[PDB]
Amino acid sequence: STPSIVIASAARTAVGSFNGAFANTPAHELGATVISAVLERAGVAAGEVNEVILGQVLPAGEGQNPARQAAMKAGVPQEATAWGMNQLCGSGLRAVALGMQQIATGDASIIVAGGMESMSMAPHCAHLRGGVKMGDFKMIDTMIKDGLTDAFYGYHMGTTAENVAKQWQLSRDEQDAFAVASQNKAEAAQKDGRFKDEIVPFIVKGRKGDITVDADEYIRHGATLDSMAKLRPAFDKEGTVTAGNASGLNDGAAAALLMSEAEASRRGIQPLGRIVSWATVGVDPKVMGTGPIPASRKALERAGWKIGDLDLVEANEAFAAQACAVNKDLGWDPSIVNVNGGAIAIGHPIGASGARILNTLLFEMKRRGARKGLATLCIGGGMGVAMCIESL
Amino acid sequence: STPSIVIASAARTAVGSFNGAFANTPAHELGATVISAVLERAGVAAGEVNEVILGQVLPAGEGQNPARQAAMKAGVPQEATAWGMNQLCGSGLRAVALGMQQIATGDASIIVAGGMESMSMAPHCAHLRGGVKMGDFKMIDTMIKDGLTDAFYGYHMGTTAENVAKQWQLSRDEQDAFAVASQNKAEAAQKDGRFKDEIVPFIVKGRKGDITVDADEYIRHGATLDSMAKLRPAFDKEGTVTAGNASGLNDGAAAALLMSEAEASRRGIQPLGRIVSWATVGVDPKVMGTGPIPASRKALERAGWKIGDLDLVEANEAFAAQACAVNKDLGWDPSIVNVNGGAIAIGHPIGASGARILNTLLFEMKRRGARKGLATLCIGGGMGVAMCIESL
Amino acid sequence: STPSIVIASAARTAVGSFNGAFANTPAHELGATVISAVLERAGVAAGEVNEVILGQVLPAGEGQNPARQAAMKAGVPQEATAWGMNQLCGSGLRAVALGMQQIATGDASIIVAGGMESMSMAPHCAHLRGGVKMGDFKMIDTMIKDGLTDAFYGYHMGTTAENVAKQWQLSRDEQDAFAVASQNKAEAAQKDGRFKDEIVPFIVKGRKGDITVDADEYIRHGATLDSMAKLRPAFDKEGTVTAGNASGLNDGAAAALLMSEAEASRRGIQPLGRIVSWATVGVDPKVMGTGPIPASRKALERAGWKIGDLDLVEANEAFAAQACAVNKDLGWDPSIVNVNGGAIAIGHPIGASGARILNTLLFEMKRRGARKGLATLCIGGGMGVAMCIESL
Amino acid sequence: STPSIVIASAARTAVGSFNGAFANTPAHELGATVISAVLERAGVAAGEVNEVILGQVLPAGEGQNPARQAAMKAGVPQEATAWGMNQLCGSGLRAVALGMQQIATGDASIIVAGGMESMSMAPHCAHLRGGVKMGDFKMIDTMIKDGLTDAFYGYHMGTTAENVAKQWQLSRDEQDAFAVASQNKAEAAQKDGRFKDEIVPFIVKGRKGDITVDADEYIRHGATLDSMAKLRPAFDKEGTVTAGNASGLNDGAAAALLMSEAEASRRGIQPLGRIVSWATVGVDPKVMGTGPIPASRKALERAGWKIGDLDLVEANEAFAAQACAVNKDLGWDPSIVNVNGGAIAIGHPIGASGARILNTLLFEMKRRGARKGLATLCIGGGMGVAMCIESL
Numbered sequence A, B, C, D: 001s002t003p004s005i006v007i008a009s010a011a012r013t014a015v016g017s018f019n020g021a022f023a024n025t026p027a028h029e030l031g032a033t034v035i036s037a038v039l040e041r042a043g044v045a046a047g048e049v050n051e052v053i054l055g056q057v058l059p060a061g062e063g064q065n066p067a068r069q070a071a072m073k074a075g076v077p078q079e080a081t082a083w084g085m086n087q088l089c090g091s092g093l094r095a096v097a098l099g100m101q102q103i104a105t106g107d108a109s110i111i112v113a114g115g116m117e118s119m120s121m122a123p124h125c126a127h128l129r130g131g132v133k134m135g136d137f138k139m140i141d142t143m144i145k146d147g148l149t150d151a152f153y154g155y156h157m158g159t160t161a162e163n164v165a166k167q168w169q170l171s172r173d174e175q176d177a178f179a180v181a182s183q184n185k186a187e188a189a190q191k192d193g194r195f196k197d198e199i200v201p202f203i204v205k206g207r208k209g210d211i212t213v214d215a216d217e218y219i220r221h222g223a224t225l226d227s228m229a230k231l232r233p234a235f236d237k238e239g240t241v242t243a244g245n246a247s248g249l250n251d252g253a254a255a256a257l258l259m260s261e262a263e264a265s266r267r268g269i270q271p272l273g274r275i276v277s278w279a280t281v282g283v284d285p286k287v288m289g290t291g292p293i294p295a296s297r298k299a300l301e302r303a304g305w306k307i308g309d310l311d312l313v314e315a316n317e318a319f320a321a322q323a324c325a326v327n328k329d330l331g332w333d334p335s336i337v338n339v340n341g342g343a344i345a346i347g348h349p350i351g352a353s354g355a356r357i358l359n360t361l362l363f364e365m366k367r368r369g370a371r372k373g374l375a376t377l378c379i380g381g382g383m384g385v386a387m388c389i390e391s392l
């Protein structure tokens, strides 16, 4: 008699490149589009939504509770509720776990959950109430400070990726080959229409003409191992991690519509899948990229699943270094991992990422008839999140 | 049977005045102290915490996931997890209901949940990626923009208070008499030592000497009706809402340690209460101060309680206009509400506030042997949140 | 026996467009090239220079006394002196008058005087010592605030141009025809090589390569009356003044090397002319564009010249409106004025402008054998400056 | 006969401490008050002024040509002119010399010349036109960058002071003794009323009551040798220069009214003195504090005076180390130098400083009946300025 919560529908924007397609688009506008889309896709009216839960890491200057702004712009009435949350990179997936819990505790019926992020729109900042009596001071890039800098050891996420490259003795070649394989899988899938279903177009409004954005613009077409092998290391001069074998800075949103299984049945909805389990676990901040290991093992143990049971896997590629380490420790078939590419190619809109890869997982699970699935993400400050999805 | 989760223990910092005692104290530092406090108070080792969940509305510049920074500074091991969330003024109490949900769904055994806020340390910000080829630009106060300003209508929270005052025909006098009652109640509680149990002293580390802060410094000593009636309207030149009958800008943190009833009994812990229900509902952002009315009613319905069963209430005083209005609608005995004073006196450290009033309720329920209690707050953008607590 | 001071030599950079050729070139670097050039042109060694005097309105952030920075870079000895000055648009010409005065009172023999300006490099700023306790504040564009905004009435110099347009009843048609004539005369002069003599090339050092700039890049080629006529008014929605009939925002330096007539004779130098007189007079800030009227009249009377004695004139074009009013009042033959075009086409690097038009005057006087010349500028805050030059 | 220019009258504000009395008072406000005062003291109407010349190193953000704002505020007519200039610390005295040249060349009859500075109001800046697509950037303190940092060697003026200390082998003790004597002489002069004649009171207007400032607030009362000796070196860790034996960061204005000797006689004015000579000379930037040596010597030679002919001297105290060096080299009787204290005590409002000390000299010469005086200052970037004054 345990609660069975399903994902009735999902959708994501395309992922924009840094200061690219969505250079001037507030996170909450991207969120509103995905919210309306999951509702239209499921045939559910906005007024039936109890609450919107949206992960977002970089809200500075966007005003009160951007999740609420997203919900209200999507047409979800004032009666519903909304809130944001921040488990950094895990945010978008975690939000789905959290939404599932609202329904499992009988506190709601229909949740919209996911994530949203405008890294482009993130401001610079300084604390100036006390004044600066004399001397220079720093205007601080909130994207870097609040999104990409380890709070404990003081270094960029890319150095934690170097720490993983040295513990696992991963060569520069092994990482450059992984990223080339990710770009090529993503270019293949995009041209074959495999992102069409999950992507809802977004209308960037302008003065000299609106623009429809429905293609992931951060993917690199014709990615040779040459353009990878010619890059300098970005975080250590005798290291292996580069702009080419790391993910980038990106804008996007993504969302899922959750309700009980019996509810989806009552509404004539064919659900994208059932949430069987989730799990988050901590690891050393220094090697934060390993997060997916204990989070996925725990998720799998809560499902009563073996690693071999899995038919599909979205394992977020923040860095090639961390991804290979995860694929090695866990030891699943790499041919079913990031089957349509991953974040090195597609982008990593921090708060949105977890709901982005969940989209890719669900829609590709429909495409090929995979029964069991698992999405998982490493997290700055040292954590992982994971979720097991079973098709119906 | 049903899960049953208890608040094993609770603690909060004093609430500091704006650019006051905590002027230069990062939110997570305040948060850390209160995490160590709830652990110590319950007799639980930090190594036993599965997850720290902390409300926070104004984290700009503090770096990656300040809940994880509070958790680590407090000595919760890297293996645990941590996140922040934002349901604005409701964040601190919502984090507690979220934590309870973690335990009810079987995903955790032991949560620290609460909130934290340094409104003092909130930076001014500006989006400057595109560059500013010519012309003045605004450095935006994130405290005002992201905390205090309604996103839909463009005006401060105090203006929603004017809308509520007007709806309910609340005179200036009546708002002012409420504010004085609240100050006089709070100065009394302070003097008679009724804040001591709940407060854990925070030590401010400076160059010139450590300062231990263990007293709410926002409370005005010897407040009079005469003093209030001298003040000018702060939001409307023929309005009723002043600085004297509105809460303030404040710094502080507050948390609670949650576990199952059965686990408290295993550990010999005598908990502060059982979380019997909670609820959140939405309303017109224009009159967000009415949030607590449907929130408290839904919460009481979920608990199976009538309003007269309540023995003690903490209904947050964002503004006298809204506080009076909520009290007149629900009809609870004003004498069991904010019995040691409310936020006009004590302060409103946004993200911490909901855990702040929860602390006050729990320790006063204990000291007078109350059995049934409710905490509730209005939420900017048009929401309310409430929680019902029963003593063991 | 009244002292006679000559201009032995002169030089100017090309005038750069706003954030264009000299986008990242500090004013002092442009100044240094022009100091070296006037020395080279006169056959005078840097070791012989007593003082360098440079007009400069927007030095913020450039460091201590950019005039000294310029002169040291050009190898003027540490035993010499250097200072900057600021009479706004008048500065580069006032500098020369002041340098002439050093020699006249016997305090110096050899002066390099002019001005320099990098409007591109001008920063944004805020008084932040006292703090901003709460609320937004402005980051102020120093170029606009200290350069282009009237300090009394608070509006841009364009509005003073509107005031002049109304008071002199100057049509949009007349102003635009003037603007097009300036563009077309400057393009002709450019293509014929008439700026070559005065322009010294400036090498913009980069990383991917050095670029030699020796063309005035703000000059529009093939400028049409239609392109002027289609612009909207820039300062008053029912006005006549536009971006097209106003000058621009620009970068440049320019200078003159001064000595007594007898010293030039001793050296065998053929000077560019003798400074027979100068003057500066104030007018109403509201119609500051009129400055050249009383200044030119005073300069001429000090020279004992009638207006009809002039063979050539450089009257600076801050705005078509004021250029037209000045020509109307003075009544000098427009065909002898801004013969090679003016600032509408060439640009207006504020602190340099006055020495820029002096350069154009002097080299045209030489080229055509004009005997008597005058340069004059209008000045924000309501002033004018004029200088009479006679050929030797 | 030669042109003889006299100082008819003089006045200065008190010198305010950094973020002290004048923390929020724009320099031009201070200037306006001293302009009005020199007019009143001379019995000359504002309508009679031809030009205002005001030294000012740090005008960023104050708007167009603060000299003109100052002159207009004092009711100097729109028909007059005004300009600012910058020879750093020498500026306030150089303006006077420049003012004298306007009259000697017959270009003006009546000049108000001096300087003004608000180091408190100096802003922080950043060049932001190109944008900062990613990363932290610096907000630069303009007071330090444009006022106090050497542009060639990149270090503060205090480092130049160390270089002079080492070269002249000046002990810590000798420097501190000098500093203590400056404080103690200034304090005696203050108590005895010796600054009253030269100071014009300034009214600081504020919402909560006007404050009249007529005392130099930087002067330390009861300054002890021990208070100096305890300090740590501020620039070199085995240096000798400290906050105590250097001057401060200060706000002030000061000026003089000039006219020919014959015009003063026509008007029946008894002048404060005749300007007999002035000089400016350069020195190595690295030892800029030595500027007063070649400059004083040149001024004296130009006057036909031996050093021993001087009855009184104001040699500016940028730093004890340099003031000591200057006095050692010149060898004048130290008992006639800075007779009422100097800038270590009184403060150093850069652009005003040279006119400030001139005020002190003039009024002491008058009060004790000294016939021959000299004022002189060192100048960052390696210069000196000096002026010889004789009583009539």
Ligand SMILES: CC(=O)OCCNC(=O)CCNC(=O)[C@H](O)C(C)(C)COC(=O)C(C)(C)C
Pocket: C089, C144, C147, C148, C156, C157, C158, C234, C242, C243, C244, C246, C247, C248, C249, C318, C319, C348, C350, C380
């Ligand atoms: C005083 C002087 O420098 O002479 C005239 C200077 N003219 C200008 O600076 C106008 C340049 N204008 C432009 O580039 C566009 O018309 C503008 C609308 C972008 C300018 O914007 C403004 O309104 C200013 C006055 C703030 C520059």
Ligand SMILES: CC(=O)OCCNC(=O)CCNC(=O)[C@H](O)C(C)(C)COC(=O)C(C)(C)C
Pocket: D089, D144, D148, D156, D157, D158, D234, D242, D243, D246, D247, D248, D249, D317, D318, D319, D348, D380
């Ligand atoms: C030429 C000149 O500058 O005159 C002397 C004025 N004094 C100063 O510039 C130094 C003022 N110094 C101080 O208040 C303290 O020494 C300080 C160490 C706190 C200043 O901090 C600094 O390092 C600088 C940049 C101001 C020198």
